[PDB]
mmCIF file of C-alpha atoms and ligand atoms in Angstrom:
data_model
loop_
_atom_site.group_PDB
_atom_site.id
_atom_site.type_symbol
_atom_site.label_atom_id
_atom_site.label_comp_id
_atom_site.label_asym_id
_atom_site.label_seq_id
_atom_site.Cartn_x
_atom_site.Cartn_y
_atom_site.Cartn_z
ATOM 1 C CA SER A 1 28.482 -12.750 34.278
ATOM 2 C CA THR A 2 27.662 -9.419 35.911
ATOM 3 C CA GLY A 3 25.880 -6.203 34.981
ATOM 4 C CA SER A 4 26.076 -2.666 36.357
ATOM 5 C CA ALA A 5 23.732 0.202 35.384
ATOM 6 C CA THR A 6 23.298 3.720 36.658
ATOM 7 C CA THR A 7 19.805 4.653 37.885
ATOM 8 C CA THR A 8 18.755 8.339 37.762
ATOM 9 C CA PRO A 9 15.917 10.118 39.619
ATOM 10 C CA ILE A 10 13.141 11.217 37.201
ATOM 11 C CA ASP A 11 12.736 14.637 38.921
ATOM 12 C CA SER A 12 13.865 16.859 41.789
ATOM 13 C CA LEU A 13 11.921 14.900 44.449
ATOM 14 C CA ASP A 14 13.306 11.406 43.588
ATOM 15 C CA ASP A 15 9.708 10.316 42.792
ATOM 16 C CA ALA A 16 11.124 7.346 40.823
ATOM 17 C CA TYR A 17 14.363 6.218 39.241
ATOM 18 C CA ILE A 18 14.999 5.210 35.637
ATOM 19 C CA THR A 19 17.644 2.858 34.333
ATOM 20 C CA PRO A 20 18.523 2.419 30.660
ATOM 21 C CA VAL A 21 17.740 -1.032 29.250
ATOM 22 C CA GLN A 22 18.695 -2.338 25.774
ATOM 23 C CA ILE A 23 15.927 -4.362 24.080
ATOM 24 C CA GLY A 24 16.193 -6.087 20.701
ATOM 25 C CA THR A 25 18.625 -6.155 17.827
ATOM 26 C CA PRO A 26 19.814 -3.595 16.977
ATOM 27 C CA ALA A 27 19.402 -2.304 20.521
ATOM 28 C CA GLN A 28 16.470 -0.090 21.363
ATOM 29 C CA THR A 29 17.288 1.736 24.630
ATOM 30 C CA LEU A 30 14.334 2.425 26.902
ATOM 31 C CA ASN A 31 14.450 3.992 30.382
ATOM 32 C CA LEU A 32 12.685 1.632 32.755
ATOM 33 C CA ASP A 33 11.597 1.866 36.373
ATOM 34 C CA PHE A 34 13.160 -1.102 38.191
ATOM 35 C CA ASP A 35 10.497 -2.329 40.581
ATOM 36 C CA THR A 36 11.288 -4.887 43.307
ATOM 37 C CA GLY A 37 7.523 -4.812 44.135
ATOM 38 C CA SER A 38 6.386 -6.353 40.820
ATOM 39 C CA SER A 39 7.375 -9.033 38.341
ATOM 40 C CA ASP A 40 6.505 -7.805 34.829
ATOM 41 C CA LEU A 41 8.928 -6.237 32.343
ATOM 42 C CA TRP A 42 6.555 -4.099 30.279
ATOM 43 C CA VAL A 43 7.223 -1.265 27.843
ATOM 44 C CA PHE A 44 5.540 1.441 25.903
ATOM 45 C CA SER A 45 5.544 0.145 22.363
ATOM 46 C CA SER A 46 4.489 0.581 18.725
ATOM 47 C CA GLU A 47 1.251 -1.180 19.884
ATOM 48 C CA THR A 48 0.402 1.342 22.638
ATOM 49 C CA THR A 49 -2.855 3.292 21.926
ATOM 50 C CA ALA A 50 -1.431 6.485 20.313
ATOM 51 C CA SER A 51 -3.501 8.841 22.579
ATOM 52 C CA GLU A 52 -1.860 7.132 25.632
ATOM 53 C CA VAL A 53 1.718 7.930 24.483
ATOM 54 C CA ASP A 54 3.079 11.425 25.368
ATOM 55 C CA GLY A 55 6.864 11.626 24.962
ATOM 56 C CA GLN A 56 7.885 8.061 26.027
ATOM 57 C CA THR A 57 10.411 6.122 23.951
ATOM 58 C CA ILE A 58 8.658 3.074 22.510
ATOM 59 C CA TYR A 59 9.795 -0.452 21.765
ATOM 60 C CA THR A 60 9.027 -1.488 18.160
ATOM 61 C CA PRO A 61 9.302 -5.272 17.915
ATOM 62 C CA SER A 62 9.046 -5.231 14.094
ATOM 63 C CA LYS A 63 12.424 -3.391 14.015
ATOM 64 C CA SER A 64 14.121 -6.098 16.110
ATOM 65 C CA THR A 65 15.574 -9.086 14.284
ATOM 66 C CA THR A 66 15.463 -11.088 17.579
ATOM 67 C CA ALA A 67 11.860 -10.291 18.575
ATOM 68 C CA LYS A 68 9.289 -13.090 18.423
ATOM 69 C CA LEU A 69 5.609 -12.903 19.327
ATOM 70 C CA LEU A 70 4.856 -15.122 22.345
ATOM 71 C CA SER A 71 1.718 -16.366 20.623
ATOM 72 C CA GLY A 72 -1.486 -16.215 22.705
ATOM 73 C CA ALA A 73 0.171 -14.574 25.700
ATOM 74 C CA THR A 74 -1.429 -11.540 27.307
ATOM 75 C CA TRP A 75 -0.778 -9.557 30.465
ATOM 76 C CA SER A 76 -2.619 -7.099 32.664
ATOM 77 C CA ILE A 77 -1.374 -5.438 35.841
ATOM 78 C CA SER A 78 -2.806 -3.105 38.463
ATOM 79 C CA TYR A 79 -0.469 -1.305 40.907
ATOM 80 C CA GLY A 80 -1.156 -0.158 44.503
ATOM 81 C CA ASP A 81 -1.421 3.493 43.301
ATOM 82 C CA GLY A 82 -4.413 2.480 41.072
ATOM 83 C CA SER A 83 -2.354 2.647 37.836
ATOM 84 C CA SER A 84 -2.494 -0.161 35.287
ATOM 85 C CA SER A 85 -1.352 -1.437 31.935
ATOM 86 C CA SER A 86 -1.977 -4.415 29.675
ATOM 87 C CA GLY A 87 -1.049 -5.912 26.342
ATOM 88 C CA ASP A 88 0.614 -8.768 24.539
ATOM 89 C CA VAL A 89 4.074 -10.336 24.783
ATOM 90 C CA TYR A 90 7.243 -10.721 22.715
ATOM 91 C CA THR A 91 10.409 -12.549 23.593
ATOM 92 C CA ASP A 92 13.599 -10.607 22.808
ATOM 93 C CA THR A 93 17.161 -10.059 23.960
ATOM 94 C CA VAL A 94 17.349 -7.689 26.920
ATOM 95 C CA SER A 95 20.557 -6.222 28.357
ATOM 96 C CA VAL A 96 21.045 -4.244 31.555
ATOM 97 C CA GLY A 97 24.422 -2.751 32.287
ATOM 98 C CA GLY A 98 26.235 -5.242 30.022
ATOM 99 C CA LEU A 99 24.332 -8.310 31.294
ATOM 100 C CA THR A 100 22.342 -9.965 28.497
ATOM 101 C CA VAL A 101 19.330 -12.316 28.710
ATOM 102 C CA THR A 102 18.076 -13.996 25.582
ATOM 103 C CA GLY A 103 14.419 -14.998 25.295
ATOM 104 C CA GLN A 104 13.233 -12.474 27.912
ATOM 105 C CA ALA A 105 9.481 -11.846 27.951
ATOM 106 C CA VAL A 106 8.974 -8.208 26.961
ATOM 107 C CA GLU A 107 5.366 -7.270 27.687
ATOM 108 C CA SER A 108 4.235 -4.755 25.037
ATOM 109 C CA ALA A 109 1.585 -2.332 26.315
ATOM 110 C CA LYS A 110 -1.557 -1.858 24.252
ATOM 111 C CA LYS A 111 -3.121 0.231 27.040
ATOM 112 C CA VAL A 112 -1.690 2.285 29.909
ATOM 113 C CA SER A 113 -3.499 4.327 32.562
ATOM 114 C CA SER A 114 -3.284 8.135 32.763
ATOM 115 C CA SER A 115 -0.483 8.168 35.393
ATOM 116 C CA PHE A 116 1.856 6.350 32.919
ATOM 117 C CA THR A 117 0.889 8.539 29.930
ATOM 118 C CA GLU A 118 1.507 11.701 31.987
ATOM 119 C CA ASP A 119 5.033 10.561 33.021
ATOM 120 C CA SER A 120 7.086 11.105 29.822
ATOM 121 C CA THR A 121 10.318 10.026 31.633
ATOM 122 C CA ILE A 122 9.287 6.373 32.281
ATOM 123 C CA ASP A 123 9.230 4.073 29.235
ATOM 124 C CA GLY A 124 8.102 1.025 31.231
ATOM 125 C CA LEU A 125 8.790 -1.181 34.230
ATOM 126 C CA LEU A 126 11.294 -3.927 34.932
ATOM 127 C CA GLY A 127 9.988 -6.090 37.723
ATOM 128 C CA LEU A 128 12.392 -7.652 40.215
ATOM 129 C CA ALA A 129 10.003 -9.334 42.674
ATOM 130 C CA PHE A 130 9.531 -13.105 42.489
ATOM 131 C CA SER A 131 8.271 -14.563 39.218
ATOM 132 C CA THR A 132 5.166 -16.002 40.960
ATOM 133 C CA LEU A 133 3.666 -12.470 40.636
ATOM 134 C CA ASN A 134 4.203 -12.220 36.875
ATOM 135 C CA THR A 135 0.851 -11.531 35.163
ATOM 136 C CA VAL A 136 1.432 -13.221 31.787
ATOM 137 C CA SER A 137 -1.333 -15.702 30.878
ATOM 138 C CA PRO A 138 -1.688 -18.496 30.068
ATOM 139 C CA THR A 139 2.055 -19.214 30.619
ATOM 140 C CA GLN A 140 3.579 -17.208 33.496
ATOM 141 C CA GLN A 141 6.975 -15.667 32.582
ATOM 142 C CA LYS A 142 10.228 -15.162 34.455
ATOM 143 C CA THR A 143 11.741 -11.866 35.517
ATOM 144 C CA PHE A 144 14.961 -10.591 34.027
ATOM 145 C CA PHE A 145 16.709 -11.530 37.297
ATOM 146 C CA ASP A 146 15.285 -15.051 37.364
ATOM 147 C CA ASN A 147 16.374 -15.583 33.716
ATOM 148 C CA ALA A 148 19.853 -14.129 34.379
ATOM 149 C CA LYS A 149 20.381 -15.940 37.732
ATOM 150 C CA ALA A 150 22.109 -19.141 36.561
ATOM 151 C CA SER A 151 24.606 -17.057 34.432
ATOM 152 C CA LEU A 152 25.515 -14.605 37.223
ATOM 153 C CA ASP A 153 28.707 -14.914 39.268
ATOM 154 C CA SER A 154 26.500 -14.734 42.453
ATOM 155 C CA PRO A 155 22.647 -14.970 42.417
ATOM 156 C CA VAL A 156 22.166 -11.411 43.691
ATOM 157 C CA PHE A 157 21.346 -7.921 42.657
ATOM 158 C CA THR A 158 21.929 -4.737 44.624
ATOM 159 C CA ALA A 159 20.122 -1.425 44.796
ATOM 160 C CA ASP A 160 22.089 1.669 45.676
ATOM 161 C CA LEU A 161 19.647 4.530 45.146
ATOM 162 C CA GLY A 162 20.799 8.144 45.455
ATOM 163 C CA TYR A 163 19.304 11.075 47.348
ATOM 164 C CA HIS A 164 18.788 13.719 44.684
ATOM 165 C CA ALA A 165 21.534 11.965 42.725
ATOM 166 C CA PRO A 166 22.140 8.952 40.478
ATOM 167 C CA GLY A 167 22.804 5.522 41.959
ATOM 168 C CA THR A 168 23.471 2.007 40.773
ATOM 169 C CA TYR A 169 21.804 -1.360 40.177
ATOM 170 C CA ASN A 170 24.342 -4.190 40.078
ATOM 171 C CA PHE A 171 23.634 -7.790 39.063
ATOM 172 C CA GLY A 172 25.761 -10.784 40.064
ATOM 173 C CA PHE A 173 28.192 -9.156 42.490
ATOM 174 C CA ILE A 174 28.366 -7.083 45.696
ATOM 175 C CA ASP A 175 30.501 -3.898 45.276
ATOM 176 C CA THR A 176 32.340 -3.821 48.639
ATOM 177 C CA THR A 177 33.358 -0.157 47.881
ATOM 178 C CA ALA A 178 29.699 1.009 47.731
ATOM 179 C CA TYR A 179 28.893 0.750 51.492
ATOM 180 C CA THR A 180 30.388 1.335 54.931
ATOM 181 C CA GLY A 181 30.629 -1.196 57.744
ATOM 182 C CA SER A 182 29.092 -4.633 57.251
ATOM 183 C CA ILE A 183 25.961 -5.898 55.492
ATOM 184 C CA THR A 184 23.301 -7.251 57.858
ATOM 185 C CA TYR A 185 21.225 -10.011 56.257
ATOM 186 C CA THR A 186 17.644 -10.760 57.256
ATOM 187 C CA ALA A 187 15.223 -13.498 56.313
ATOM 188 C CA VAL A 188 12.783 -13.132 53.408
ATOM 189 C CA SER A 189 9.341 -14.706 53.004
ATOM 190 C CA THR A 190 8.386 -15.268 49.348
ATOM 191 C CA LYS A 191 4.835 -16.339 50.318
ATOM 192 C CA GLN A 192 3.241 -13.197 48.786
ATOM 193 C CA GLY A 193 5.820 -12.987 45.919
ATOM 194 C CA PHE A 194 7.615 -9.942 47.407
ATOM 195 C CA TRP A 195 10.959 -9.303 49.094
ATOM 196 C CA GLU A 196 9.103 -9.440 52.429
ATOM 197 C CA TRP A 197 11.094 -9.154 55.641
ATOM 198 C CA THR A 198 10.654 -8.088 59.261
ATOM 199 C CA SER A 199 12.259 -4.937 60.640
ATOM 200 C CA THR A 200 13.220 -5.099 64.337
ATOM 201 C CA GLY A 201 11.891 -1.606 65.217
ATOM 202 C CA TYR A 202 12.336 2.077 64.864
ATOM 203 C CA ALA A 203 13.411 5.344 66.420
ATOM 204 C CA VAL A 204 12.300 8.938 65.735
ATOM 205 C CA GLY A 205 15.136 11.464 65.685
ATOM 206 C CA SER A 206 17.396 11.073 68.714
ATOM 207 C CA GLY A 207 14.645 9.146 70.586
ATOM 208 C CA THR A 208 14.982 5.712 72.102
ATOM 209 C CA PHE A 209 14.746 2.726 69.785
ATOM 210 C CA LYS A 210 11.414 0.842 70.024
ATOM 211 C CA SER A 211 11.934 -2.912 69.585
ATOM 212 C CA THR A 212 8.912 -4.129 67.614
ATOM 213 C CA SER A 213 8.475 -6.468 64.624
ATOM 214 C CA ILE A 214 7.365 -4.624 61.430
ATOM 215 C CA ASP A 215 6.699 -6.930 58.474
ATOM 216 C CA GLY A 216 7.030 -5.175 55.134
ATOM 217 C CA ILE A 217 8.412 -5.320 51.612
ATOM 218 C CA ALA A 218 11.519 -3.804 50.048
ATOM 219 C CA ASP A 219 9.963 -1.982 47.060
ATOM 220 C CA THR A 220 12.112 0.166 44.760
ATOM 221 C CA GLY A 221 9.029 1.056 42.706
ATOM 222 C CA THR A 222 7.279 2.784 45.647
ATOM 223 C CA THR A 223 8.374 6.381 46.393
ATOM 224 C CA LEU A 224 7.534 6.644 50.086
ATOM 225 C CA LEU A 225 7.895 4.723 53.363
ATOM 226 C CA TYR A 226 4.518 3.280 54.430
ATOM 227 C CA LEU A 227 4.399 2.013 58.035
ATOM 228 C CA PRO A 228 1.757 1.263 60.632
ATOM 229 C CA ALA A 229 -0.310 4.185 61.828
ATOM 230 C CA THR A 230 1.140 3.956 65.368
ATOM 231 C CA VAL A 231 4.713 4.389 64.030
ATOM 232 C CA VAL A 232 3.755 7.151 61.626
ATOM 233 C CA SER A 233 1.844 9.109 64.293
ATOM 234 C CA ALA A 234 4.891 8.849 66.606
ATOM 235 C CA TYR A 235 7.080 10.285 63.862
ATOM 236 C CA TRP A 236 4.874 13.241 62.862
ATOM 237 C CA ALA A 237 4.093 14.106 66.484
ATOM 238 C CA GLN A 238 7.741 15.339 66.631
ATOM 239 C CA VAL A 239 7.076 17.967 63.849
ATOM 240 C CA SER A 240 5.288 21.185 64.972
ATOM 241 C CA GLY A 241 2.158 21.693 62.860
ATOM 242 C CA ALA A 242 2.225 18.266 61.121
ATOM 243 C CA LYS A 243 -1.143 16.664 60.564
ATOM 244 C CA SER A 244 -2.894 14.025 58.529
ATOM 245 C CA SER A 245 -4.999 15.691 55.787
ATOM 246 C CA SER A 246 -7.834 13.605 54.209
ATOM 247 C CA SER A 247 -8.049 16.345 51.467
ATOM 248 C CA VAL A 248 -4.340 15.927 50.506
ATOM 249 C CA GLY A 249 -4.255 12.144 51.250
ATOM 250 C CA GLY A 250 -1.702 11.866 54.046
ATOM 251 C CA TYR A 251 0.565 13.664 56.466
ATOM 252 C CA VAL A 252 1.595 17.194 55.614
ATOM 253 C CA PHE A 253 3.845 19.507 57.548
ATOM 254 C CA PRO A 254 4.886 23.175 57.469
ATOM 255 C CA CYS A 255 7.502 23.777 54.840
ATOM 256 C CA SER A 256 9.353 25.872 57.503
ATOM 257 C CA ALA A 257 9.948 22.685 59.615
ATOM 258 C CA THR A 258 13.194 20.828 60.099
ATOM 259 C CA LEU A 259 12.318 17.107 60.003
ATOM 260 C CA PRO A 260 13.803 14.548 62.397
ATOM 261 C CA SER A 261 15.551 11.457 61.118
ATOM 262 C CA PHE A 262 13.868 8.056 61.178
ATOM 263 C CA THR A 263 15.745 4.890 62.115
ATOM 264 C CA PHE A 264 14.653 1.348 61.202
ATOM 265 C CA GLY A 265 16.145 -1.878 62.511
ATOM 266 C CA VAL A 266 17.595 -4.700 60.455
ATOM 267 C CA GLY A 267 18.393 -7.402 63.011
ATOM 268 C CA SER A 268 20.701 -5.656 65.532
ATOM 269 C CA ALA A 269 21.747 -3.085 62.869
ATOM 270 C CA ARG A 270 20.156 0.319 62.325
ATOM 271 C CA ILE A 271 19.564 2.295 59.113
ATOM 272 C CA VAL A 272 19.134 6.009 59.598
ATOM 273 C CA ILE A 273 16.981 7.969 57.145
ATOM 274 C CA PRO A 274 17.992 11.640 57.390
ATOM 275 C CA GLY A 275 15.119 14.084 57.903
ATOM 276 C CA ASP A 276 15.741 15.742 54.537
ATOM 277 C CA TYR A 277 14.899 12.419 52.797
ATOM 278 C CA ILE A 278 11.367 12.675 54.294
ATOM 279 C CA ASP A 279 10.674 16.036 52.608
ATOM 280 C CA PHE A 280 8.520 15.713 49.463
ATOM 281 C CA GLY A 281 8.081 19.489 49.107
ATOM 282 C CA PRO A 282 5.031 21.653 48.604
ATOM 283 C CA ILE A 283 1.718 19.847 48.068
ATOM 284 C CA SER A 284 1.057 22.238 45.125
ATOM 285 C CA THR A 285 3.307 24.730 43.524
ATOM 286 C CA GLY A 286 3.958 27.681 45.945
ATOM 287 C CA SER A 287 2.211 26.082 48.931
ATOM 288 C CA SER A 288 3.667 26.343 52.411
ATOM 289 C CA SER A 289 2.300 22.868 53.213
ATOM 290 C CA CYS A 290 4.780 20.100 52.405
ATOM 291 C CA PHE A 291 4.067 16.420 51.830
ATOM 292 C CA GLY A 292 5.630 13.895 54.141
ATOM 293 C CA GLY A 293 7.745 10.962 53.041
ATOM 294 C CA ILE A 294 6.561 8.669 55.819
ATOM 295 C CA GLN A 295 2.890 7.741 55.463
ATOM 296 C CA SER A 296 0.494 5.242 57.029
ATOM 297 C CA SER A 297 0.108 1.813 55.462
ATOM 298 C CA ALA A 298 -3.379 1.394 56.965
ATOM 299 C CA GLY A 299 -5.779 0.427 54.139
ATOM 300 C CA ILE A 300 -2.868 -0.640 51.855
ATOM 301 C CA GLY A 301 -2.666 -4.008 53.676
ATOM 302 C CA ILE A 302 1.168 -4.133 53.713
ATOM 303 C CA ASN A 303 4.046 -2.009 55.058
ATOM 304 C CA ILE A 304 6.317 -0.790 52.254
ATOM 305 C CA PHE A 305 9.986 0.116 52.594
ATOM 306 C CA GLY A 306 9.986 2.285 49.434
ATOM 307 C CA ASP A 307 12.680 4.518 48.067
ATOM 308 C CA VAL A 308 12.674 6.905 51.089
ATOM 309 C CA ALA A 309 14.000 4.014 53.167
ATOM 310 C CA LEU A 310 15.991 2.101 50.565
ATOM 311 C CA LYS A 311 17.962 5.162 49.362
ATOM 312 C CA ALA A 312 19.409 5.418 52.916
ATOM 313 C CA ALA A 313 21.090 1.973 52.468
ATOM 314 C CA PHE A 314 23.022 -0.310 50.213
ATOM 315 C CA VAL A 315 20.503 -3.117 49.692
ATOM 316 C CA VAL A 316 21.323 -6.697 48.660
ATOM 317 C CA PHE A 317 18.563 -8.788 47.102
ATOM 318 C CA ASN A 318 19.951 -12.287 47.549
ATOM 319 C CA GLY A 319 18.150 -14.724 45.216
ATOM 320 C CA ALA A 320 19.925 -17.879 46.440
ATOM 321 C CA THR A 321 17.781 -20.989 47.069
ATOM 322 C CA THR A 322 16.985 -19.443 50.506
ATOM 323 C CA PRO A 323 16.495 -15.746 49.609
ATOM 324 C CA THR A 324 17.574 -13.031 52.008
ATOM 325 C CA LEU A 325 17.876 -9.202 52.075
ATOM 326 C CA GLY A 326 20.977 -7.370 53.186
ATOM 327 C CA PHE A 327 21.249 -3.781 54.355
ATOM 328 C CA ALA A 328 24.366 -1.725 54.903
ATOM 329 C CA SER A 329 24.871 1.953 55.673
ATOM 330 C CA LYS A 330 26.650 4.012 53.028
HETATM 331 O O1 REG B 401 1.995 -0.692 43.653
HETATM 332 C C1 REG B 401 2.900 -0.382 44.415
HETATM 333 N N1 REG B 401 3.659 0.715 44.207
HETATM 334 C C2 REG B 401 3.515 1.535 43.016
HETATM 335 C C3 REG B 401 3.867 0.902 41.684
HETATM 336 C C4 REG B 401 3.714 1.960 40.602
HETATM 337 C C5 REG B 401 4.678 1.498 39.509
HETATM 338 C C6 REG B 401 5.689 0.640 40.254
HETATM 339 O O2 REG B 401 5.236 0.529 41.609
HETATM 340 N N2 REG B 401 3.240 -1.138 45.483
HETATM 341 C C7 REG B 401 2.518 -2.360 45.809
HETATM 342 C C8 REG B 401 3.420 -3.386 46.465
HETATM 343 C C9 REG B 401 2.499 -4.207 47.346
HETATM 344 C C10 REG B 401 1.444 -3.278 47.798
HETATM 345 C C11 REG B 401 1.377 -2.111 46.807
HETATM 346 O O1 REG B 402 4.744 4.823 45.144
HETATM 347 C C1 REG B 402 3.817 4.679 44.363
HETATM 348 N N1 REG B 402 3.961 4.972 43.070
HETATM 349 C C2 REG B 402 5.193 5.603 42.603
HETATM 350 C C3 REG B 402 5.541 5.510 41.135
HETATM 351 C C4 REG B 402 4.351 5.507 40.196
HETATM 352 C C5 REG B 402 4.278 6.904 39.606
HETATM 353 C C6 REG B 402 5.343 7.664 40.361
HETATM 354 O O2 REG B 402 6.286 6.684 40.795
HETATM 355 N N2 REG B 402 2.603 4.202 44.751
HETATM 356 C C7 REG B 402 2.300 3.852 46.138
HETATM 357 C C8 REG B 402 0.988 4.457 46.607
HETATM 358 C C9 REG B 402 0.660 3.698 47.875
HETATM 359 C C10 REG B 402 1.317 2.341 47.705
HETATM 360 C C11 REG B 402 1.986 2.391 46.336
#
């Protein structure tokens, strides 16, 4: 089997991407944020505290003939932005892009933090990191990918995120028309439950490539690129007037600037992030200070190749017995 779904940016900055997901029978279509940095499929629901729902589409298990309570099971998750959610669990049929999993754990939110309530465009999360991070207790549950794996033509999924445009998530096959050149594969450590890999270095603009090992995670559910402070300082030093602002919470730059590209290594290959991808626009409406898309990972404890980086590539998440990541230009 295979599946193929279009993923659409939630707003003009590509802050996140939503993908329609069919849950239950008859189908209830919810727009979920596919998150390779977490392992819970959770949804706004008929159980979510009414004051915490503001325009999201909700899952109503009582309207699904295939829903079953996973008796006793609860979940609770906290994300690196300080957001959180928690609730109980149903099993139901879930389909993405024509690929169907029966008996998927669908984590029904009873509570969500303010950041979720305030984002009317995101109806929940579909985690695609390793199932060892799933938060369901007392019986940990599998991701949609882990449950689909054995049925797929190839044990893979691919992320092809757009810049200010829709893109694609594919399951079970590699669309050889979706990228240019060859795919360079790199080793993954699952020790922390993430798609964790080691970049071979970086370049700023037209500058020389610095060969240096940068451990980090491929995380579709993080907006920005978070890298060590040394790398980030080297990048922003090439932008007149850029500075780190403790009041704003990161690097800002003059909206009149033209940003340099940023290159990261994947083995001997190179992925180039155009400068325009690093523009996150005015810090507040009408401001001439703009927020940067490359930020320091210091204090976060991990480097994160978020959407700013991943949208510059065709990315293969290879879930074979020995997992690997692949990157191609596109
Ligand atoms: O929490 C992280 N990003 C934000 C969440 C918000 C909803 C989906 O993604 N990233 C974590 C990955 C490991 C360190 C931080
Ligand atoms: O990227 C992050 N969240 C993005 C999602 C949640 C709401 C908008 O889209 N959070 C990062 C902050 C520092 C590490 C994780």
